[PDB]
């Protein structure tokens, strides 16, 4: 049994709400109807812009990327090295104030991907989808699909309403623990602060970049609340959230946990040892870490070998491609531990 | 007023000081007006609270614990300041910081949500510092803070004491109700350069968001570490924006929102934009090249990496001569400039880093 | 050159929607800005590509019987012609184009990218000016700007804010500070030199939530929770003292509703009597702002259980400030005919349907 | 024969110091070791008009309403008032830190079990809780629940979330459980901007402007279905105003009208369930007070059942507590604000 090829973030997208309707009870696919379908499409990747999909991907007819099984699994297997893709779906259900409107439209996507994606190819994985508004009915959520295997993972979206530490959303890493499964923060976000702490980007490029400091904001709080001693078989995927920026905000809470220790006494292990056993990260982006040497020395100030997970980012367009990390790193060992091993912390899959 | 420019000779740069006014110092400064609503109303801020910060002090007020006068809060003493800092550690060009009012730890004057208020308080500050501080002991040099969230009042004042030599920057706050790219802010940038004047910004709370861009933060580790990220949010804003392509002698520092992170963050501003850059066609130069130019950031709390020469590595990957030695006097994680350092740390970069580097931004 | 507008027999409507027909502001766009809504759409306070943070529930909040054969309702001049303008004998109607497109609320001066946000205002005045006001002057314009950029909003007040066929200046009701904040203070000083007063339409976005204590979860808590704005709005522009520095300057609120603003301003007064001290400068009373500065409009008209304290409230607000509007085409639209109640004084309706508005845009 | 009960009163923490007798040592040690920073809020900023009456005794620091001898003596005094409903606006809310919060509030519910209750059994007061973590409030409230001279729950008008989300449910739950009101008083957590557009620049701008957050709860609360899960809840506004309610009543009720398909549990109108669940303290009055007016605002209401008696005291308003006899000709009507709508909420006799 050999650790298989995962490719542990890609992505469908939902062509438009109205493939929702299959997987709705009458009174909210009426509901739909009668409201002309809004569509919670997110702005996260948008569709006309140069990340939103690569030039040569397969389409549909009208020229979007992703939107069926059939074209996605055509494009990310053909070359044979992947053996197993983690679909995520962004599709903006969590943006949905109205709270029962949240939970419906985040259960229908879930039908939508399990029935339209994971019935369509057994290599095909996916993370649940869940209703981040309202903490116990996305744990909920979590144990609806908790009997399906080929959910591997909750998704979360990198900025949420409150810190994911925060007892309010304790049951949401409850809910993952207990179904056995990993959480994955995806980069997105509800919108309901500013996205960063000094008001509102005014741009897309803007905001894509500087998501990675609310990233620090959700470790430190995860870890500061005591996510990790209370639930301690939980496990962390950054999803689609850049790497670079981790050790230098290591370092500075593993000093200023020093200082502060006795306020979070529960934590007895410096985060720096923390993060490197509970934290894994995609690769793509993997913003200048594919340039010579600059993995290997990435993995030297990480201080591990095993928090890094390969990705596509299929079918998203970034400055490298997925095997270009290839290219920052003189060891085979490394690229087999990014390409297989360290994603069977995860997955448990095999070839 | 009339002074020599700073001279940096065989002594280095601090470009972090902390003094605090005496109870009473500004009433000299102030309008009656200002005074009265004081005693009525204190200084309201962004918070519920009459009297503290959204996030108090730890530990003895985070101060360090050998650095309290007779009588007053540390940094209120001017001969301590001089022996225990200015004499013992020989800095020739001390930059002022005052960001309170008074003997409570950090509460700018420029947050006051009272305006006019904030402005009175910031001017009061100035002509205090100017009068009790530098002019006394030139070693010292102020940067001024200004209400930044009011360029007509932050002009003005720039405008009044901007060009007095004692001055040697702008002071302003990590966070602000817009990101500071943001064209509000370019009349400040406009009056600051017109004066050839650089600007600092130093670590705040407040701004009118919360303290994360994804919630309020809980335990003291979150709040501390969480002070890097406005700084990250605002140098995105300043660069992309093109502020510097407006302004294109503008100098920004970066205070107290620590280094090495910069550099990671630069990265994946370039390889983000290389395939997104259309969004924004008029930028002139690649994000990472307006470093040099434009973006400094001073040294303290030292980064401490696990391994010790990723330190030199990560500030050379920033930019090794826009790093700028601070001690941060008297705050607890105040830094020695004898042992910041690591041990193997280069003694080249160390030297620009205590002398040069800072020469150059505060134009020496 | 455009006549100035004649109110003889018929009335004055604050507030109309229309839309332009798709692609009908690209002539008015320089390409660049073409390039980046086709590449980007109009971001905003969002995380959507295309929606706003509250979508509109049934029939995108349209009137069911104002959708012309093809577009969106308020996109057919003809239609605006015959089901509004000569059903109702509006002969001043104020356009306020909320959405530069097929849509009901995505205002164009809340674009995050505020140089595509004053294009697309720009935009937006000159297409209604060429499609809408001179064809039928009947209508005038309301000009949006980019409150949020003050020197941008002024160089289009300056454009374009002399042209006959504007009447007021178009802001939103949400803004990331409060509206006496000198922030905005330029752009009250443009509007006061071009002899224009200013209307604030019910927005979502801003930057913040929608409520002062966190986002709405339903319908009825959005929809209500419109008037909180306008209550705060209100509270900075008078306490503020915006006004003593333009004592010229006409505000209108549109679609924050009318009787609220009554025990509001009480309130105000009885709390100021007591905290003026900490505002002394402060020319007047707060309430007696409101006479010379404060207008309302009317839709959707206040119900009280018992009809009689509409005019009463009216009246305690300030009966010669009170506006109608019908809200062409949105399903809350207001009829003139039958807005009012039975009993409802005709002197305070003529006014509001008439002589109030008139003063307002100096007509 | 239902007691006039002053339905808002205030104590005042001289200083954190007070806490250290109820704080365990881990908490009293980290106190003193932090240079006892106060939450003391600015809600009524100490020197300014509205932070108490000229009349009002002090202590030592010129401080009225820190000690139960003061606030006894001068509510008391003239022998109208049966009991009074003691609210400390101490800033736990405004913690950060969670079990600093949750440490803090129990201390204080502590200091006034202690310190106030046992002192005079005219006394009532509000349950304070760690509003920051919905289950260590309504652990907070069980707690007290035992102790029925703690006759309602405190909350904030501001809050963090909306109070009627369900991520607040456990709030609700409790307090219905306990049999208590819960009461929302002027105040806020300050985690947002105070206003839906921004921060307002005075405390002035926010004072007044506060009831338009409250417009917020109700409709939260209601629309969320508070009052169908937790049937027996009565919410008490104080401190709060409330002329403001019958326009906000009309557009909720209306709008009600067009929505009830995204809110089919409310069943019964928002103007009955806001007449039938909701009482306001009546200090400050906004100006009711004047001739004729609180008939009016009563009409307007559609209910004498709403208003319930209050001095807010120590605060100076432009009007006193019993000038809102001023405002009205019915005796019938002050019976009711005075005693009988009161009894609804606390069930006090004379
Ligand atoms: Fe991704
Ligand atoms: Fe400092
Ligand atoms: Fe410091
Ligand atoms: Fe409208
Ligand atoms: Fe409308
Ligand atoms: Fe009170
Ligand atoms: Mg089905
Ligand atoms: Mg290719
Ligand atoms: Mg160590
Ligand atoms: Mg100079
Ligand atoms: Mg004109
Ligand atoms: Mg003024
Ligand atoms: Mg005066
Ligand atoms: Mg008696």
Redesign the interface.
Known sequence: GVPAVVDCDVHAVLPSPHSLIPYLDEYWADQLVAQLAPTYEPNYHPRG???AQHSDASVDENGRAATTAENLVKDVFADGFTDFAVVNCLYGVQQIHQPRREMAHARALNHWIANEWLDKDDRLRASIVVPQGSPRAAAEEIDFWSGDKRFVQVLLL??????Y??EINWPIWEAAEAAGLPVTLHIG?VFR??????????????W???????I???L??II??GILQKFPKTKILLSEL?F??L???M???????K??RP??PWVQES??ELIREHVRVTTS????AEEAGRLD?IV??L?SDRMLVYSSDYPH????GPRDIENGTHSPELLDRIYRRNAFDLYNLVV | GTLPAPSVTTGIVDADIHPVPQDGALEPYLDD?WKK?I????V?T???????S????????AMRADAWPESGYPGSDRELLRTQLLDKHNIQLGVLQCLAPGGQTLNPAGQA???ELAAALCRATNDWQLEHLVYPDPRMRAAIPVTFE?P?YAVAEIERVGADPGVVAVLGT???????????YWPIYEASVAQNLPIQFHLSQG????????????????????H???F???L??LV??GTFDRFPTLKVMFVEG?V??F???I???????????????DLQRKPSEYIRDHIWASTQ?I?????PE?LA??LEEFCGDNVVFATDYPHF?FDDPETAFPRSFPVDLRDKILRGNGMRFFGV
């Open positions: 812009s140069a990340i990198g900025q949420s309403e409150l810190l530490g925060r976000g602060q500013a996205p960063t702490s000094v008001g509102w980007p005014a741009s897309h490029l803007e894509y970049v500087g998501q990675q400091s609310n620090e904001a959700q430190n709080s500061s609340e850049g670079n920026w050790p230098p905000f370092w500075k809470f593993d000093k200023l946990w200082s502060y306020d979070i985060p720096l982006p993997s913003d200048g020395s030297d100030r201080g367009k970034h400055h490298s | 007006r609503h005693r009525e109303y204190g309201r962004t918070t519920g609270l009459q009297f503290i959204e996030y108090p002090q730890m530990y003895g007020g949500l009272n305006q009011t007509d990590s966070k602000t109700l817009e990101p500071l790219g943001s064209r509000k701004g009118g968001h919360a303290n994360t861009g994804t919630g309020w933060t809980s335990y003291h580790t979150e709040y501390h570490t969480g890097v990220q406005s990250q949010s605002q995105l804003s992309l924006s620590n090495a992170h550099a990671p963050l990265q994946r501003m370039d390889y983000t934009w290389e395939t997104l850059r259309g969004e924004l066609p709390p980064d401490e990496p696990e391994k990723h590595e990560l994680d």
